[PDB]
Amino acid sequence: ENLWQVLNKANMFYRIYSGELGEELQYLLKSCCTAKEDVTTLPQIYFKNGEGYDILVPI
RNA sequence: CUUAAAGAGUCAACCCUUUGCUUAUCUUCCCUAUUUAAAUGUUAGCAGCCGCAUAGGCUG
């Protein structure tokens, strides 16, 4: 199994997330938990937010 | 300015063959269709003869 199987059974990602297996592991997990952004080849719609619109990109 | 914006699914074909749904059946008794009454509505628009008339008159 790759990392995707082991992190997703028996609530293992929440176990590393709440640090039952270690706070330095919490760090390792969060070092991979980042927000990378790209808006190309994605839908961009307008949603009314009250007297104006927001360009929502639904992911 | 709508998970906005955009897009060629194309092609091809042997469903075969086989077959016993036969067998025997009581439908059946019953019994009131009874009674009337204008056909009226002129109920016919005819037969000859006087005539050129299929115009018009006469005769019963």
Side-chain angles (χ1 to χ4, degrees):
Chain A
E1 336 166 334
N2 60 339
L3 189 44
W4 188 88
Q5 271 94 59
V6 47
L7 262 187
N8 288 278
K9 28 153 181 53
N11 324 330
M12 168 88 76
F13 189 82
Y14 199 39
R15 194 141 67 242
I16 303 187
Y17 211 72
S18 42
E20 245 309 279
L21 317 171
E23 299 289 325
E24 159 284 350
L25 207 53
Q26 276 224 45
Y27 141 78
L28 238 356
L29 198 77
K30 258 53 106 219
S31 89
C32 308
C33 296
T34 101
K36 194 194 148 284
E37 201 205 10
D38 160 273
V39 310
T40 88
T41 88
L42 271 186
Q44 302 182 36
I45 76 192
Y46 291 84
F47 219 84
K48 176 192 300 312
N49 211 12
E51 71 270 317
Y53 304 81
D54 311 359
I55 301 181
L56 296 191
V57 179
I59 60 178

